[PDB]
Design a protein around this ligand. Structure first.
Ligand SMILES: *[C@@H]1O[C@H](CO)[C@@H](O[C@@H]2O[C@H](CO)[C@@H](O[C@@H]3O[C@H](CO[C@H]4O[C@H](CO)[C@@H](O)[C@H](O)[C@@H]4O)[C@@H](O)[C@H](O[C@H]4O[C@H](CO)[C@@H](O)[C@H](O)[C@@H]4O)[C@@H]3O)[C@H](O)[C@H]2NC(C)=O)[C@H](O)[C@H]1NC(C)=O
Ligand SMILES: *[C@@H]1O[C@H](CO)[C@@H](O[C@@H]2O[C@H](CO)[C@@H](O[C@@H]3O[C@H](CO[C@H]4O[C@H](CO)[C@@H](O)[C@H](O)[C@@H]4O)[C@@H](O)[C@H](O[C@H]4O[C@H](CO)[C@@H](O)[C@H](O)[C@@H]4O)[C@@H]3O)[C@H](O)[C@H]2NC(C)=O)[C@H](O)[C@H]1NC(C)=O
Ligand code: POV
Ligand code: POV
Ligand SMILES: *[C@@H]1O[C@H](CO)[C@@H](O[C@@H]2O[C@H](CO)[C@@H](O)[C@H](O)[C@H]2NC(C)=O)[C@H](O)[C@H]1NC(C)=O
Ligand code: CL
Ligand code: CL
Lengths: 333, 113, 336, 333, 333, 336
C-alpha cells in the first residue's frame, strides 16, 4: 500500500536531526566502503595527476531509520539524501572532483529494515600522484587515493574496507594506453593532525610504463644517426668535402632530433634517462667530426699516421658506443 | 582624435587620426523644421552598410581604406532632400546606429538642393 | 485556466515523489528512444566522442491519472521536479551536459490515463576504447550504454519504444565528423551485474571508419618520394664523391624531418601502428642507400669492377624490394 | 507612492499559475524576437563553431498580468522574472551558453498596462557551424543560429521576427580579423519531430576569408623555393656537387615548409586547396632533381643530349609551373 | 546592546520591497563608483582581450534604510545584500566575469545613519580589447572597460565617478609583462539604444609595446643571416660548390627562422610589420643566390663581366639592404 | 538525543548572524593558522602558484555558550551557515576552490564557553610577481596575504594561533614542485589602507630557488659544443674551400635550430634574461667564425702569408675570448 509506505517514510523523518551523527554522544559509527573502478583516464606527468571514475559506496547503521511492517529494502529517490545524515568523507589528494548529474544526480540511497543505509555515488576525481621521472621512460610509479573523514575524529567514526581485500573491484579490467597496473593495495590506518586523529583508508596502484613505443621512436633514430656518423671513417681522408658534409649534417640531424623530442615529450624540467642517452649520442657524433678535423690537420705531413688513426677509429667508435649502451641499459634496467 | 573633411551628385568623407577607435562612419541631414535624420552608415573595416528607410535604392555608401575615404552617391534627388549634410564618427561601444547623440566627431555642413 | 490549476493541484495532493510508480506491487516499465541531432567529434587522444541527443522516456503512473476537457497536459518542465522520474544515467558517460538555456530543455506531458512522456536535450561525452593497431586503416564501434542508477531489474526495466533498430534515429544533417564515416548503428538490451544488484542496460553501437586521404597526401606520398630520391642516387657517378655523400646525408635528414612531423599526429600508444611500420621501413631503406654508397666507395679504387657490380645490382634490388614491401603492406592493410 | 505600486504588483502575482502558459487551452501565444549582436568573438575551424554575444529580446502578451491605475511601463527588478511565465526558447545548435551574471544577472523584465511583457537577456553562446573546408584558404562559410520552442508545439506558441528584416541589428559591430561578413539572412519556418511540429527562426551569416595573409605567408615561400630549384638548369653539368646540393636542399626546404605548415595551420584532417598546391610544388622540385640525375647519368658519353635536356628544361619547367598556377588559381577562384 | 541593533535592522527590512528602486516614481538615483585595480594579468592578442581584477565600490542613498539612535556605521554580513535593492550595473564589453567567493562571497555592505549605502565587490573580468596589429610589434593599443545600467534608463538612474579623476586607483602600480601603461582616462556620458538612453562610465588605458625583446630575438637573427648571405660575393666565381652551398643553406636558415617565428608570434591571420621585414630578408637571400646563378652562367665566356658583376654586387646588396631598412624604420617608427 | 537537539535549538533561538560578536563593545579577535598539505605547481607563464591548505580560524562568541553533558560540540558543517563567521579572503588570490566532495570540507566545533573553531580545506591560486632577468638562475619569494574583506581594523583583528613562525606548517611529503626548491618561509602581519578604510593583513612568503641542471644539459652544453665545433674549422686546410664553407654555414644553421628551441622554454617577458645573453653571444661567435673564413679565403691567392697569419691567430683568439666570456658569465650569474 502506497499510503502505508508513505506514512512510514515520513514518520522516519519526522523529528530527524541531520546536524547530529547517529549515536551522537556515544560510540563511533562504523562505515564500510566499497569502490568499483569504472575507468582510469589520462595519467599526466606534466600535471602529476591521474583521473579516476568510480562507483563509491558507503554502508552504515542509523537506528533512527529502523522501520517495521514493510518486508522490503526501500530504494528511495536520491533527493532524500539531502534529509539524512551521511559521513563527511573526502579525498585528501584530489584536485578536482564532481558527482555526475545527467540525467539526475548519480546518487543512490537504499534503506534496510534494521536502519542500515547504503549510499552510492559516481565520482570522477583527478587525484594527485607524485612522479619520480628520473628514470623516465623506464620508470615505475605508485599512485594512491586517500579516503578520510573531515570533521569526525576516531572517537566519532571509524572506516573499514567492506569485504576485506575484495572491497575494490574493476582494477584487472582497467587498460591504460602507456602503463600496466602491476598491483593494487588496500590500507587502513589513522592520521593525526593538530585537530585530532582521523581514520584513513588508502587505495594504491603500482603502474609500470611500456617501453616499446619509446624503443621504436626515441632511441632507434638516434642509434641509427650515430651509426651513420661512423661511415666517414671508411671514406678516404682526401675527400674533405664529403667527410665534412657527412659529419656536420650528422650533427645537424642529432640537433633536430633532440630539439623536437624536447617539444614532443612531456615538459618535465629535470634530467631523465632519455636525456642522458640523447646527450651521449650527441657527444659521439661531435667526437667523430672532431676526429676527422684532427686527421685532416696532419694528413699532409704524416699520411701514414692519419691512415692509422682512421683505421683505429673504425674499431674504437663502435666498441665505445657498445660499451656506453651496455652501461646505460644495465644501470637503468 | 579623428578629423573629418568633406568633398563634393556625390559626397566624400575623409578622416585622419585614430580612425581605429571610431570604426563606423555615418551620414546625417538636418532640416530647418525637423531634427537631424540618419541617412546611412558604413564600417571602415568590414564594409557592411546600413541605410535609412527613405534613402534605399537612391543613395549608396561605399568605402576605400587606401586613403581613408567613405563615399555617398546620391541618385534621383527629390525636393524633400533640401537639408544641410554632416558626416560623423561613432565609437565602438557607443550604442545605437540611428541616433546623432551617439556620434562623437562631426564634420562640416553641406547644402544640397 | 483555474480549472486546470485545480486539476494540477489535485494531482499533486498527497503525491510522494520519493516512491516509484507501483512500488511493492509491480515493475515500473520505461520505454526509451533517442533522436541523435549531431554525432559530434571523435577524439583518438582522449579515446572518447561527443553526441547531442533528444532523450525520450515514457512510463505509466496511475497517481497522475486525471479527467478533464483536454486529453493531454503539456506542462512546463518545472512540473517534472515534483513527480517521480527515472534515474537514467550513461554507464560510459564522462561529462555530460543537460542543456539549460534559455530555460531547462525539458518537456513533460501527461496523458489522461496516467502516461508520462518526459523528454530532454543532452550533450553526452562517452568513452570509446579504441584499438589503434591498424591506424589509419582502423574501424571502430563506439558504444553508448544507459540504464537505471538505483533501481534493479526487479523494480525498473527499460524497453525500446519500438523495434530496436528504429528506436535510435540519427538526423540527416547530424554529422560533425571530420576524419570518420558513420557506417551505421546496432541497438541492443541486456543485463549487467554489480555489487549492488542486477540492472537493465540499453546499448547502442555506432560503427565508424577512418578516412585515409589526409595521411596519404601528408605522410605516405612524401615518404615514398623520399625513398625514390634516395634510390635515385645509385645512378650518379662513383667519382662525384661529395655529390653522392650530400645526397645520402640530406635524404636521411629529410626522412628524419618527415617522421618527426608524422609522429605528432599519431596517437600515443605503446604498440606500433601501421604508419609506424611504414615510416620505419622507409627510414631503413634510406639508411641502407647511404651504407651502399659507402660500400661502393670503399672498392672504387682497388676493385673497380666490384664497385660497378654493386652499384648495378643495387639499381635493381632496391626498387624491387621497396615495391614488394609496398605491395605486401597495402594488401595486408587495405582488405582487412 | 511606493505602497500602491507594491500592492498592485502583489495583486498581479497573487493567484498566478506559473505552470500554465498564457491562454492555456486556447489559441497559441505569439512571441516576437529581436537580437542585437554585440560581437562574434571567435570562429574556429578546429572545433567547427563560433562564439556569439547577443542581446536577446522576447515580446509577448499575458492577460493575467494586465493592470490598471498606474499609467507607467513598470521596469521591474530581474528577480521578478523568476515568478512569471517565460517562453522555453532554446538554440538547437548551441554547445555551451550562459547568461552574463556580473554584477547582477543580465536580465530585464518590463511590463505594460495591457499585459505585454518585454523580456531581455544578455547571452554568450558557442554555436556549431559545420564548415566545408575543401577550398581552404579560399573558402566561404555559412554559420547559423536556430531558435526553437522546446516544449510547445505550433498549437501552443508561434514565433515571428519583430520588425521584419530589422529584427536583428548590430551586424556592423562584427569585426573578425580573418573573415568579413558578406550577408545575413532571417528565416522563419516549422520543424517536425516525432513529438510534433515546432516553430523555428533562423539567423544566418555568410563569411568570406581574407586571403592576403596566406598569400604572403604560405604561397610565396613555396613559389620562391620552386623557382630557386630551376637555378640548377643554368649551372654547368660538370658541377655535380653544386647541382646536387641545390636540388637536395630545395627538397629539404620544401619538406620543412610543409611539415611546419602542418603544425601552424588549424588541424583539419582532409585535403584542401593549400595541400594540393604544396604537393604540386614538392612534385616540381622533385622532378628538377630527377632531371639533373638523368643529365648527370648520360652526360659522359652523349654531351649533346645532356646539353639539349638542360636547355629544354630551362623552358619546360617555368612554363609548366605557370600552367599549373593558372589552372589552380582559375579553379579555386 | 546587540538587541537594539537587531531590532533596528529588522525594522528597516520589515515591509521593504526590493523590486522598487529608491525614490521609485520620483527623481533618479545617483550612483557613485570607485575602482581599485589590483592586477592586469594577460593582455592577449590571439583572443584580443585582457583580464582585470578590481575592487568595485558603489555608493548611493536609500531613505528606506535610514536609521537613528545608533552612532555607528553598520557593516553587515554580506548576505544582507540579498535583501536590499542594488544597482543593475554591468560591464558592457566583458566576455566572462565572476565575483570571488573564497572563503565567502567577496562582498561588503556598509550602511550609514542617513541611508547611504556602500556596496563593494571584488571582481575578475575578461574584457574585450580590439587590437590594430598592423604595426606589430611596434604597436600602441587602447583598452577600455564600459560600465552601464542594464535595465534602468536615465529616467531612473544616474552614474558618476566618485572623486573625479581620483576615482580609479592602482593603475600606476600595474606592471604588464609585455606593455607599459602610458595614460588612463575616465569618461562619463549617455548612450541611446532602441530601448532608451542609459548612463555610461568608461575607463580606458593606453598601452605601448616594449620592443627590446623583439629587437634581440626577432630582427637580429634575420639581419645576421642576410649579412651572411653577402659573403658569397667575396668567394671566387669558379668555386661553384662553396657558393651554392652557402646560398642554399642561407635560404634554408631564413626559412627555418620564418616558420619558427610565425609560431612564436601571435596566430592572428593578417599582415603585420614583422611579416614585411621577414619577407624582405627572404627576398634578399633569394636574390643573392639568383645573382650567383647569373655569374656562373656568364663567367665561362666573359670572365671580366662576371668579375664586374660580383664587384658591383658587393656594394649594391648592402646599400639596398640599408635603403630597405631606412624605409621600413621610417614608415613604422 | 533530544537533549542535544534542544541545546542547539536554544543556541539558535534569537541569534542574529548579520551581527559580529562584540559589535559595539569590543574587537572580534580571530586567531588563524594554516596547514599546507601540498605546495602546488609554480607557473612562470601565468606568474602564479597553487597551494592546498587546511585553513583554521578560531574566535569567541558569547551568544553561543551552553551547558550540557559534553564540553565540545563537533557539529556538521551546515551549522556554520547559521552563525556569524569571518569574511576572510586572500588579497592576491586568482581563482580559489573550497572543496565539496563528497560533502563540504568544513568543520565547526563549539566549546562550552563560546569558543568557535572553524576549519576548511581550500585550493588557492595566487599571484607571484616574478623578476626574470636572471633566468634560469632566479630565486623568488611568492607571497600569500589574507584578511577581512569588510571589517576594518577597529572591528576585526587577526593573530597567529601560536608563534608566527610556527603557525604556517608545511607537510613533509607536500611539495609538488618540479622546477623549484622550497627553501623556507617567512610569516608576518601588518596593516593596509584603502579607499574603504584600514585593514589587518597576514602575510606568508615562500622562498623558491630554481634548479638549473635541465637547462645545463639541454641548452648550455649543446650551445658550447656548437661554438667549439665552429672554432674547430680554423684547423682545416684553406685549400678545402667547399669543406670550410659547408662547415661554417651548417654550424650557423645548427646554432639557429638550438636558439629557436631554447627560445620556446623561456617565459614571455620583454627584456633580456641570462639565457638570452648566452645565446646571443654564442650566435655572434659562430657568425664571426664564418666571417673569418671569408676573410681568410679572400687573401689565399694574393697574400698567402697573411691568410696563414689570420688563421693561426684566430685559432688562439676565438677560444680565449669564449673562455673569458664563460668565466665572466658564470661568475656574474652564479655568485649572485
Ligand atoms: C605506494 O606507497 C605507499 C606508501 O606511500 C604504500 O603504502 C604502504 O603500504 C604498506 C603495506 O604494503 C602499509 O604498511 C601496513 O600498514 C598497516 C597499518 O599501519 C598503521 O596501523 C598500525 C596498527 O594497525 C600501526 O601499528 C602503524 O604504525 C600504522 O599506524 C599495518 O597494519 C600493516 O602491518 C602489516 O605488516 C606488519 C609488519 O610490518 C605485520 O606485523 C602485520 O601483521 C601486517 O602484515 C603494514 O605495516 C603502509 O602503512 C602504507 N603506507 C602508507 C603511507 O599508506 C603502498 O603499498 C604503495 N603501493 C603499492 C601498490 O605497493
Ligand atoms: C580610448 O578610446 C576612447 C574612444 O573609443 C577614448 O574615449 C574618448 O575620450 C574623450 C576624452 O579624451 C571623450 O570626449 C569627452 O567627452 C565628454 C563627454 O561627452 C558626452 O557628454 C557631452 C555633454 O556633457 C555630450 O555633448 C557628448 O556628446 C557626450 O555624450 C566631454 O565632456 C568632453 O569635453 C571636453 O573636451 C572638449 C574639447 O574636446 C571641451 O569642449 C569640453 O569643455 C570638455 O573639456 C570630451 O568631449 C570621448 O567621449 C571618449 N569616447 C568614448 C567613445 O567614450 C579614450 O580617451 C581613449 N583612451 C585614451 C587613453 O586616450
Ligand atoms: C666517449 C664516451 C662519451 C660519453 C658521454 C656521455 C655524456 C652523458 C651526459 C653528459 C652531460 C651531463 C650534464 C650534467 C649536468 C648537471 C648540472 C648540475 O648538477 O648542476 C648543479 C651545479 O652546477 C652549477 O652550479 C653550474 C652548472 C653550469 C656549469 C656550466 C659550465 C660550463 C663551462 C664552459 C667552459 C667553456 C670553455 C670554452 C673553451 C673554448 C646545479 O644543480 P641544481 O641547481 O641542484 O639542479 C640540478 C638538478 N635537476 C636535474 C633537478 C635540475
Ligand atoms: C610537371 C608536373 C606537375 C604535376 C603536378 C601534380 C600535382 C598533384 C597534386 C596532388 C595529388 C593529390 C593526391 C591525393 C590522393 C588522396 C588519397 C586517395 O586517393 O584517397 C582515396 C583512396 O585512398 C586510398 O585507397 C589510399 C591508398 C592508395 C594506394 C597507395 C599505393 C601507393 C603505392 C606506392 C608504390 C611505390 C613503389 C616504388 C618503387 C620504387 C579516397 O580516400 P578518402 O575518400 O580520402 O578516404 C577513404 C578512406 N577509406 C578507404 C579507408 C574508407
Ligand atoms: C535486503 O538487504 C539485505 C541485506 O543485504 C538482504 O539480506 C541479504 O541477502 C543476501 C542474498 O544473497 C544474502 O547473501 C545476505 O547474507 C543477506 N544479508 C542479511 C544481513 O540478511 C535481503 O535479502 C534484502 N531483501 C530483499 C527483498 O532483497
Ligand atoms: Cl572526427
Ligand atoms: Cl614547479
Amino acid at each position: 500500500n502506497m499510503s502505508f509506505v508513505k506514512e512510514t517514510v515520513d514518520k522516519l523523518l519526522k523529528g530527524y536531526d541531520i546536524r547530529l551523527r547517529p549515536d551522537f554522544g556515544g560510540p563511533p559509527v562504523c562505515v564500510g566502503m566499497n569502490i568499483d573502478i569504472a575507468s582510469i583516464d589520462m595519467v599526466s606527468e606534466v600535471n602529476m595527476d591521474y583521473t579516476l571514475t568510480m562507483y563509491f559506496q558507503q554502508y552504515w547503521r542509523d537506528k533512527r531509520l529502523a522501520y517495521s511492517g514493510i518486508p522490503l529494502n526501500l530504494t528511495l529517490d536520491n533527493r532524500v539524501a539531502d534529509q539524512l545524515w551521511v559521513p563527511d568523507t573526502y579525498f585528501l589528494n584530489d584536485k578536482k572532483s564532481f558527482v555526475h548529474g545527467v540525467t539526475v544526480k548519480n546518487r543512490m540511497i537504499r534503506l534496510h529494515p534494521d536502519g542500515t543505509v547504503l549510499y552510492g555515488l559516481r565520482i570522477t576525481t583527478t587525484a594527485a600522484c607524485m612522479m619520480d621521472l628520473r628514470r623516465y621512460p623506464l620508470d615505475e610509479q605508485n599512485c594512491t587515493l586517500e579516503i578520510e573523514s573531515y570533521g569526525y575524529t576516531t572517537d566519532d567514526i571509524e572506516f573499514y574496507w567492506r569485504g576485506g581485500d575484495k572491497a575494490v573491484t574493476g582494477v584487472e579490467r582497467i587498460e591504460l594506453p602507456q602503463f600496466s597496473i602491476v598491483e593494487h593495495r588496500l590500507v587502513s590506518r589513522n592520521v593525526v593532525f593538530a585537530t585530532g586523529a582521523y581514520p584513513r583508508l588508502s587505495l594504491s596502484f603500482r603502474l609500470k610504463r611500456n617501453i616499446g613505443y619509446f624503443i621504436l621512436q626515441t632511441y632507434m633514430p638516434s642509434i641509427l644517426i650515430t651509426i651513420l656518423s661512423w661511415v666517414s671513417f671508411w671514406i678516404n681522408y682526401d675527400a674533405s668535402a664529403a667527410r665534412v658534409a657527412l659529419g656536420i649534417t650528422t650533427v645537424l640531424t642529432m640537433t633536430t632530433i633532440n630539439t623536437h623530442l624536447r617539444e614532443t615529450l612531456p615538459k618535465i624540467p629535470y634530467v631523465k634517462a632519455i636525456d642522458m642517452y640523447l646527450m651521449g649520442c650527441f657527444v659521439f657524433v661531435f667526437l667523430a667530426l672532431l676526429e676527422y678535423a684532427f686527421v685532416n690537420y696532419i694528413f699532409f705531413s704524416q699520411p701514414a699516421r692519419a691512415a692509422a688513426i682512421d683505421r683505429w677509429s673504425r674499431i674504437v667508435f663502435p666498441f665505445t658506443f657498445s660499451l656506453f649502451n651496455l652501461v646505460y641499459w644495465l644501470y637503468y634496467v | 582624435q579623428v578629423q573629418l573633411v568633406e568633398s563634393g551628385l556625390r559626397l566624400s568623407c575623409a578622416a585622419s587620426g585614430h580612425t581605429f577607435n571610431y570604426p563606423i562612419m555615418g551620414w546625417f541631414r538636418q532640416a530647418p523644421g525637423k531634427e537631424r535624420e540618419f541617412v546611412g552608415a558604413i564600417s571602415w573595416s568590414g564594409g557592411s552598410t546600413s541605410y535609412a528607410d527613405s534613402v534605399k535604392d537612391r543613395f549608396t555608401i561605399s568605402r576605400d581604406n587606401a586613403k581613408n575615404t567613405v563615399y555617398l552617391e546620391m541618385n534621383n534627388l527629390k525636393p524633400e532632400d533640401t537639408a544641410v549634410y554632416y558626416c560623423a564618427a561613432k565609437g565602438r561601444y557607443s550604442g545605437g546606429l540611428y541616433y546623432p547623440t551617439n556620434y562623437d566627431y562631426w564634420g562640416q555642413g553641406t547644402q544640397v538642393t | 485556466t483555474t480549472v486546470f490549476t485545480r486539476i494540477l493541484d489535485r494531482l499533486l495532493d498527497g503525491y510522494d515523489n520519493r516512491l516509484r510508480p507501483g512500488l511493492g506491487e509491480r515493475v515500473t516499465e520505461v520505454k526509451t528512444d533517442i533522436f541523435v541531432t549531431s554525432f559530434g567529434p571523435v577524439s583518438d587522444h582522449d579515446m572518447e566522442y561527443t553526441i547531442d541527443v533528444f532523450f525520450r522516456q515514457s512510463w505509466k503512473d496511475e497517481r497522475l491519472k486525471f479527467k478533464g476537457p483536454m486529453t493531454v497536459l503539456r506542462l512546463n518542465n518545472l512540473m517534472a521536479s515534483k513527480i517521480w522520474t527515472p534515474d537514467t544515467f550513461f554507464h560510459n558517460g564522462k561529462k555530460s551536459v543537460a542543456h539549460n538555456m534559455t530555460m531547462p530543455n525539458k518537456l513533460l506531458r501527461i496523458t489522461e490515463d496516467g502516461t508520462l512522456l518526459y523528454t530532454m536535450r543532452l550533450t553526452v561525452r562517452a568513452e570509446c576504447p579504441m584499438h589503434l593497431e591498424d591506424f589509419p586503416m582502423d574501424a571502430h564501434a563506439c558504444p553508448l550504454k544507459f540504464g537505471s542508477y538505483a533501481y534493479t531489474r526487479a523494480e525498473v526495466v527499460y524497453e525500446w519504444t519500438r523495434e530496436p533498430a528504429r528506436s535510435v534515429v540519427v538526423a540527416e544533417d547530424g554529422s560533425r565528423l571530420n576524419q570518420y564515416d558513420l557506417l551505421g548503428q546496432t541497438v541492443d538490451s541486456g543485463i549487467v551485474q554489480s555489487s549492488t544488484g542486477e540492472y537493465v542496460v540499453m546499448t547502442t553501437h555506432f560503427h565508424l571508419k577512418r578516412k585515409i586521404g589526409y595521411f596519404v597526401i601528408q605522410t605516405y606520398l612524401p615518404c615514398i618520394m623520399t625513398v625514390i630520391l634516395s634510390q635515385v642516387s645509385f645512378w650518379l657517378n662513383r667519382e662525384s664523391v661529395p655529390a653522392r655523400t650530400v645526397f645520402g646525408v640530406t635524404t636521411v635528414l629529410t626522412m628524419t624531418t618527415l617522421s618527426i612531423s608524422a609522429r605528432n599526429s599519431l596517437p600515443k600508444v605503446a604498440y606500433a601502428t601501421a604508419m609506424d611500420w611504414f615510416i620505419a621501413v622507409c627510414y631503413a631503406f634510406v639508411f641502407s642507400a647511404l651504407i651502399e654508397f659507402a660500400t661502393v666507395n670503399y672498392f672504387t679504387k682497388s676493385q673497380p669492377a666490384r664497385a660497378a657490380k654493386i652499384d648495378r645490382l643495387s639499381r635493381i634490388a632496391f626498387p624491387l624490394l621497396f615495391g614488394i614491401f609496398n605491395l605486401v603492406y597495402w594488401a595486408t592493410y587495405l582488405n582487412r
